[PDB]
Ligand binder design. Structure first.
Ligand SMILES: [Mg+2]
Ligand SMILES: [Mg+2]
Ligand SMILES: [Mg+2]
Ligand SMILES: [Mg+2]
Ligand SMILES: [Mg+2]
Ligand SMILES: [Mg+2]
Ligand SMILES: [Mg+2]
Ligand SMILES: [Mg+2]
Ligand SMILES: [Mg+2]
Ligand SMILES: [Mg+2]
Ligand SMILES: [Mg+2]
Ligand SMILES: [Mg+2]
Ligand SMILES: [Mg+2]
Ligand SMILES: [Mg+2]
Ligand SMILES: [Mg+2]
Ligand SMILES: [Mg+2]
Ligand SMILES: [Mg+2]
Ligand SMILES: [Mg+2]
Ligand SMILES: [Mg+2]
Ligand SMILES: [Mg+2]
Ligand SMILES: [Mg+2]
Ligand SMILES: [Mg+2]
Ligand SMILES: [Mg+2]
Ligand SMILES: [Mg+2]
Ligand SMILES: [Mg+2]
Ligand SMILES: [Mg+2]
Ligand SMILES: [Mg+2]
Ligand SMILES: [Mg+2]
Ligand SMILES: [Mg+2]
Ligand SMILES: [Mg+2]
Ligand SMILES: [Mg+2]
Ligand SMILES: [Mg+2]
Ligand SMILES: [Mg+2]
Ligand SMILES: [Mg+2]
Ligand SMILES: [Mg+2]
Ligand SMILES: [Mg+2]
Ligand SMILES: [Mg+2]
Ligand SMILES: [Mg+2]
Ligand SMILES: [Mg+2]
Ligand SMILES: [Mg+2]
Ligand SMILES: [Mg+2]
Ligand SMILES: [Mg+2]
Ligand SMILES: [Mg+2]
Ligand SMILES: [Mg+2]
Ligand SMILES: [Mg+2]
Ligand SMILES: [Mg+2]
Ligand SMILES: [Mg+2]
Ligand SMILES: [Mg+2]
Ligand SMILES: [Mg+2]
Ligand SMILES: [Mg+2]
Ligand SMILES: [Mg+2]
Ligand SMILES: [Mg+2]
Ligand SMILES: [Mg+2]
Ligand SMILES: [Mg+2]
Ligand SMILES: [Mg+2]
Ligand SMILES: [Mg+2]
Ligand SMILES: [Mg+2]
Lengths: 114, 155, 68, 97
RNA sequence: UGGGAGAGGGUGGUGGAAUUCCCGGAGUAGCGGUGAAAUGCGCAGAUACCGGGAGGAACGCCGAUGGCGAAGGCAGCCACCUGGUCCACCCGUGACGCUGAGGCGCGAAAGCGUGGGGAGCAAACCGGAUUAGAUACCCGGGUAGUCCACGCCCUAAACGAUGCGCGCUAGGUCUCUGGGUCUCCUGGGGGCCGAAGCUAACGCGUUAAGCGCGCCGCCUGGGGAGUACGGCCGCAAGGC
């Protein structure tokens, strides 16, 4: 069991996946917009993310998780609602950092982002 | 409509109970402009929920109204290329109106023959908790709870 | 609150003045605009070019995680 | 069903049928052809062929004029195709965003 | 002579972010994608997360209505080699000048030949959708090619649809780069607005499309047609 750890939010236009890990970054448990029961574009909404965050706290708290630094990646719509849900869950949420990957103009992107 | 909110008609209180909501139900019973008939069908039922239930028609009546008032409803909206079922909160004017409408409707499905009997027995089941009248409310609500995912698409 | 004010004279080429240079970077390690440094077009070029060498020597970051 | 009205002219069951063979083009879109009505007539310049048809997604209404009677029928069907094909695909555009 | 600015060009190095793949760990019922979906991927352990590694390509912020080039075009950072150009002194030469049919060189991309490289992307192609149908648009895959060297090809909305040089004809303003004596004054660029004037109008206007001189290229109704024949060039495609 681990009392302190990391909560990751991968927030995309299609979905919000949330995984909670240990202080060493190795996953304890994870939820997602599909896990709580949605298919298709529903998996992208904030309610979708809100359920995945809460099922992720609900999950990790059952292992003794208490404190979590929050890490956020991606400009999804259900993003800001995922962080609220983590705080209003009962987890010490000691930080929020945003490690969103931006390339310094690297690989040419697919036609739909050009 | 297209220029301002039309004003809600106030309705005169009745003369058997002096209530403004007992009247607004009387109307919903009334067919082809025969209000005298709308009265004696309703009132006969008030006798009924007294004969078979030692309590107050106006008490049974109003409680059944608060038992069919749909707190949440869905109201469609075409977002992008799909007509989603967005969950709107309901106006207490509309809650009133749907409850009164669904009562007679859920009543005028019942099996017993005379109308006044169906109006009492449906108010005698909605005031308690059961009845097809309440089912409409409970169904409509679960239709909105199931679609709270789109509750942000509200206006 | 412009950056060039909160700093008396300084060399716009001393790539080893991490203390002065680091102020010209945003809280996400990025090179700040002219609207925020107050350097003219002429001098803003030399700032950026020496931030970039300072990064290569390792004295300055290329990017920083955003905290809240 | 399919109704045909020759106003102030005489035509034949054969000619009337040729109209039906020509409205059948609109069946290509596989949408309901509700009470289609073909009105024929003769101006001092050539024939006029009118048509009102309603579908699940709207009505079609056009008029084709020409010297040749049958050539007016094609132009009428020419304009009816365009109105129907728009009714079937106009709502497809505004899907994004 | 003495200074400046700059993604100008070439060569050799090297920095960090991101994607993909492989390896280690940890973990599980989905992930991905769309307008909504499905193909696809996933209990043979995916996605999400941490560590290790390989590799190619492009350089985030700065970055701009910006800078440079004769045009095409040029953007991490370092160094070498190299071009064009502006400024200030008014020292030297002594009309040495302008243009320029031919000629020669340069010439985005795509394409070609030999060899290398190949992460991402992606013609062709396959499959899913969309749809009346959908040889498309959207989605999941994917080969040339995109990248390096050398050699070809020589095209373009190669655009300012505005050839070059010189002179002359209000100004206001914003900006880049110099020089003063630094308020401001003046040179060289980049725009905007406008005097006169021009223009069929739209618009141009000291960055002329105004007023003038020199020289070059070019036009002479639309289609046929940038086609045919011929000739030259090209490996071919195809170019003139
Ligand atoms: Mg989705
Ligand atoms: Mg009714
Ligand atoms: Mg009903
Ligand atoms: Mg019940
Ligand atoms: Mg008929
Ligand atoms: Mg007749
Ligand atoms: Mg007839
Ligand atoms: Mg046709
Ligand atoms: Mg049309
Ligand atoms: Mg010199
Ligand atoms: Mg591959
Ligand atoms: Mg693994
Ligand atoms: Mg990794
Ligand atoms: Mg930019
Ligand atoms: Mg420019
Ligand atoms: Mg002299
Ligand atoms: Mg002399
Ligand atoms: Mg010359
Ligand atoms: Mg020549
Ligand atoms: Mg070329
Ligand atoms: Mg090429
Ligand atoms: Mg080939
Ligand atoms: Mg080839
Ligand atoms: Mg090749
Ligand atoms: Mg070969
Ligand atoms: Mg490959
Ligand atoms: Mg296909
Ligand atoms: Mg198909
Ligand atoms: Mg077919
Ligand atoms: Mg396809
Ligand atoms: Mg594709
Ligand atoms: Mg691909
Ligand atoms: Mg091939
Ligand atoms: Mg080949
Ligand atoms: Mg090529
Ligand atoms: Mg080459
Ligand atoms: Mg251009
Ligand atoms: Mg030019
Ligand atoms: Mg031309
Ligand atoms: Mg030119
Ligand atoms: Mg100046
Ligand atoms: Mg100065
Ligand atoms: Mg220039
Ligand atoms: Mg100027
Ligand atoms: Mg102007
Ligand atoms: Mg004038
Ligand atoms: Mg003239
Ligand atoms: Mg001027
Ligand atoms: Mg002057
Ligand atoms: Mg100029
Ligand atoms: Mg002109
Ligand atoms: Mg010339
Ligand atoms: Mg001709
Ligand atoms: Mg050609
Ligand atoms: Mg030939
Ligand atoms: Mg040719
Ligand atoms: Mg030519």
């Amino acid at each position: 069991q681990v009392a302190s750890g990391r909560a990751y939010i991968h927030a995309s236009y299609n979905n919000t996946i949330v995984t909670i890990t240990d202080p060493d970054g190795n996953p304890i448990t994870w939820s997602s917009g599909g896990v709580i029961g949605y298919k298709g574009s529903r998996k992208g909404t904030p309610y979708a993310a809100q359920l995945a965050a809460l099922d992720a706290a609900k999950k990790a708290m059952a292992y003794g998780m208490q404190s979590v630094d929050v890490i956020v990646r991606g400009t999804g719509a259900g993003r800001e609602q995922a962080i609220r849900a983590l705080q209003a869950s009962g987890l010490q949420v000691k930080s929020i950092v945003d490690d969103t990957p931006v390339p310094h103009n690297g690989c040419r992107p697919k036609k739909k982002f050009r | 409509a297209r220029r301002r909110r039309a004003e809600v008609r106030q309705l005169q209180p009745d003369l058997v109970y002096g209530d403004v909501l007992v009247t607004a139900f009387i109307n919903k019973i009334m067919r082809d402009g025969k209000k005298n008939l709308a009265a004696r069908i309703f009132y006969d039922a008030c006798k009924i929920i007294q004969e078979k239930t030692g309590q107050e028609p106006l008490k049974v009546f109003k409680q059944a109204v608060e038992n069919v008032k749909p707190r949440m409803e869905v109201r469609s909206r075409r977002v992008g290329g799909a007509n989603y079922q967005v969950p709107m909160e309901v106006s207490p004017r509309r809650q009133q109106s749907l409850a009164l409408r669904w009562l007679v409707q859920a009543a005028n499905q019942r099996p017993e023959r005379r109308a006044a009997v169906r109006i009492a027995h449906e108010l005698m089941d909605a005031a308690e908790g059961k009845g097809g009248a309440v089912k409409k409310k409970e169904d409509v609500e679960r239709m909105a709870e199931a679609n709270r995912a789109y509750a942000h698409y509200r206006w | 609150a412009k950056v060039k004010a909160t700093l008396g004279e300084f060399d716009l080429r001393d790539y080893r003045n991490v203390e002065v240079l680091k102020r010209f970077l945003s809280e996400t390690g990025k090179i700040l605009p002219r609207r925020r440094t107050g350097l003219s077009a002429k001098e803003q070029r030399i700032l950026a070019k020496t931030i970039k060498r300072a990064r290569i020597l390792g004295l300055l970051p290329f990017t920083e995680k955003l905290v809240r | 069903t399919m109704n045909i009205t020759s106003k102030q002219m005489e035509i034949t069951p054969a000619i009337r049928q040729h109209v039906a063979d020509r409205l059948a083009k609109l069946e290509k879109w596989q949408t309901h052809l509700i009470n289609p009505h073909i009105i024929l007539s003769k101006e001092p310049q050539g024939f006029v062929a009118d048509a009102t048809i309603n579908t699940p997604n709207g009505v079609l209404v056009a008029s084709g004029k020409h010297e040749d009677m049958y050539t007016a029928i094609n132009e009428l069907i020419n304009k009816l195709e365009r109105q129907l094909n728009k009714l079937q695909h106009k709502g497809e555009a505004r899907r994004a965003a």
